[PDB]
Design a binder for this molecule. Sequence first.
Ligand SMILES: O=C1C[C@@H](c2ccncc2)CN1
Ligand SMILES: O=C1C[C@H](c2ccncc2)CN1
Ligand SMILES: [Zn+2]
Ligand SMILES: [Zn+2]
Ligand SMILES: [Zn+2]
Ligand SMILES: [Zn+2]
Lengths: 131, 286
Amino acid sequence: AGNATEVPANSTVLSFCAFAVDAAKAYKDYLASGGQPITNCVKMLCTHTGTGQAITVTPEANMDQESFGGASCCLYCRCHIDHPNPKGFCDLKGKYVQIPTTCANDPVGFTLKNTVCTVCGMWKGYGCSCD
Amino acid sequence: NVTGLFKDCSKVITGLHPTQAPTHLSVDTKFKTEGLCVDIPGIPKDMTYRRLISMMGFKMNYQVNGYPNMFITREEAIRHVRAWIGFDVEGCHATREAVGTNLPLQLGFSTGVNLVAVPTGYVDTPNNTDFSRVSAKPPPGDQFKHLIPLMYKGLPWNVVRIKIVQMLSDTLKNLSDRVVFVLWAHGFELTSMKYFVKIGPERTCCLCDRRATCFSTASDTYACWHHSIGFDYVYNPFMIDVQQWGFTGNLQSNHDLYCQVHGNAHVASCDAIMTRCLAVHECFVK
Ligand SMILES: O=C1C[C@@H](c2ccncc2)CN1
Ligand SMILES: O=C1C[C@H](c2ccncc2)CN1
Ligand SMILES: [Zn+2]
Ligand SMILES: [Zn+2]
Ligand SMILES: [Zn+2]
Ligand SMILES: [Zn+2]
């Protein structure tokens, strides 16, 4: 009974992060010890003529990015654990997230390490027009 | 190739919208094309779902620098026999809004303690994962009849985990710097540990040089067994599955080969007492 959501290549990393006091640190450490990044994300097919904004209602990848389903790029959603937000809600679930193509092999790791500019809506260091 | 870890146990026939699905497998078939997913204009997100996610199938076989192994060898377990706590969990089944997973109901320990939890699961919603009470029933059969009254005598998990930390601390503070849970067929015991165990690098207590055995979500601090009053999580426990030592039949038959003072009273604490007792006779007698 039920429907599988996961593949065996992700069992170890998701188990490790599901039990960690600090899941983001555990994921970073798992990668540094040679582990594979989380796979089975929701990658979208799009026209690559989007705005390039980081978090959007529909896919908005420009030619330097890929678009993903937002929950699938969130470590807390993938491990079914608490979000470190004040009210415990997610800012990626229910949106699409644009990830630089050079980082698209590890979308979960990308969202953990990076920040969206509140002024221009683009990732800091990967599109932000403010600095 | 799929795993049962994080299986969706809801009875909803369809999958999720691409923005809400945790994984490509979980996206509804309608969005899948050309090896990936597409957004379909006019097909909205679902804003009211509650999908129970199974915690059966954890695999603690990582090797990460600075994080200790949870499962230990027979040789390491023998050196830490004073840390041994037998542990067994009897579960109840998800029902009604979900089917296909086991929830912890009676948590038993070799100290003779049984703790009863409210049937609680991890329910994915449009905004987060809601750790909440779920519909459940004991498994059918005369061997599981004793679990029927326990369905309405459970305590909330925030209370149960404090009681587990207090019991372990009182039992072990003068015996060991750690705990070794002694298990028989560990899968469901490891799923139950998700509800009261946290892991990370080896740490020291917030009041001494002893290694940390407990963690508090109230202050994000660490404590040994002597300084853990009010702490809610067991931190970096160790464990061993005795069934993997070459036994063939059930727990009771192997336990009874060495011991006769522990009669089977069919309860989690009894199974936990038998598992520790069997391990003690196997490693230390004759
Ligand atoms: O097309 C589909 C996807 C499938 C599902 C898998 C995992 N979690 C939820 C749903 C059910 N229908
Ligand atoms: O020296 C001991 C062993 C004893 C014990 C019995 C069962 N489970 C755990 C511990 C308590 N004191
Ligand atoms: Zn999330
Ligand atoms: Zn900016
Ligand atoms: Zn201490
Ligand atoms: Zn015995």
